[PDB]
Write a protein that binds this ligand. Structure first.
Ligand code: HEM
Ligand code: HEM
Ligand SMILES: COc1cc(Br)ccc1O
Lengths: 137, 137
């Protein structure tokens, strides 16, 4: 289930983080509006760009902690508030997060490794709701 | 995005070339008049012929070179000119290329792969414009 999936992802976190974020960027190419430095780069080139590697690593380290602190895929309100208060996220809306989780769930379903994709779908929806309550536009 | 799509296509160049060319020929059966040596054969009959695989791979390799040399999905005028001046392309008009890219985009949208179909649509339109500028009727 969801808790085991956190352990699966953490066991190969760099690769899963890269894979999933690339699946997000390739499913929704207009999302590069927030990452102007990623334009004109293949997946392999992005993986060898320091700011892509460092951002994706931080995203997934923190996302796994938020998932780990959740109860039944409902994140702590404090985790949603922290994400809202992040200065580097001033231009983001809940739709950016929604799209990330749609891409993540699709990636899990296509993987062939026993992920509980329905729980990740609920987690993404519950994170979006919590972000809204915490003040994200 | 577009650059990643070039890498996806190049990774399995011949297979994609055959499936896209077949998609084109089947969507536009009259276009086979330019390909008199491929008439009267099913998709699998064509794929079994080494000359079909060789032809499609050579075509698609050049298409990927033109795509990779493009800037923001605008091909180089010199590449458009090469395509206009090729002896094998005598008598073609831009409508032949418009149909190819319609079929290519439709194939991408129907595929399970995460192609940036909007960029390929724009690339096809910009290639048609560039072919006109390079002297194709
Ligand atoms: C759980 C989800 C996310 C987490 C934990 C997260 C975390 C972070 C952190 C810690 C930074 C600081 C810079 C760094 O550490 O490299 C950052 C920056 C940034 N984030 Fe995220 N983020 C998340 C989702 C997103 C999404 C979905 C987007 C856009 C669709 C986004 C866009 C950005 C941008 C543009 C920066 C600036 C980085 C740069 O300029 O290179 N973030 N994020
Ligand atoms: C960007 C698009 C295109 C590229 C890069 C391209 C490139 C090429 C190349 C490299 C060849 C030589 C292939 C070989 O060695 O067998 C070729 C041949 C040919 N192409 Fe194109 N082509 C394109 C579009 C088209 C279109 C739209 C048509 C007609 C609908 C067309 C009709 C032909 C024909 C009739 C030949 C000769 C085939 C034969 O020898 O029997 N091409 N093309
Ligand atoms: C429309 O022309 C072609 C397109 C592809 Br893709 C492969 C072979 C061709 O002749």
């Amino acid at each position: 289930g969801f808790k085991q999936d956190i352990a699966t992802l953490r066991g190969d976190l760099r690769t899963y983080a890269q894979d999933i974020f690339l699946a997000f960027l390739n499913k929704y190419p207009d999302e590069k509006r927030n990452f102007k430095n990623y334009v004109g780069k293949s997946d392999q080139e992005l993986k060898s760009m320091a700011k892509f590697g460092d951002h994706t690593e931080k995203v997934f380290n923190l996302m796994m902690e938020v998932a780990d602190r959740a109860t039944d895929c409902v994140p702590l309100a404090s985790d949603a508030s922290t994400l809202v208060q992040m200065k580097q996220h001033s231009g983001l809306t809940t739709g950016n997060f929604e799209k990330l989780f749609v891409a993540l769930v699709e990636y899990m379903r296509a993987s062939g490794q026993s992920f509980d994709s329905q729980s990740w779908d609920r987690f993404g929806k519950n994170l979006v709701s919590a972000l809204s309550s915490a003040g994200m536009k």
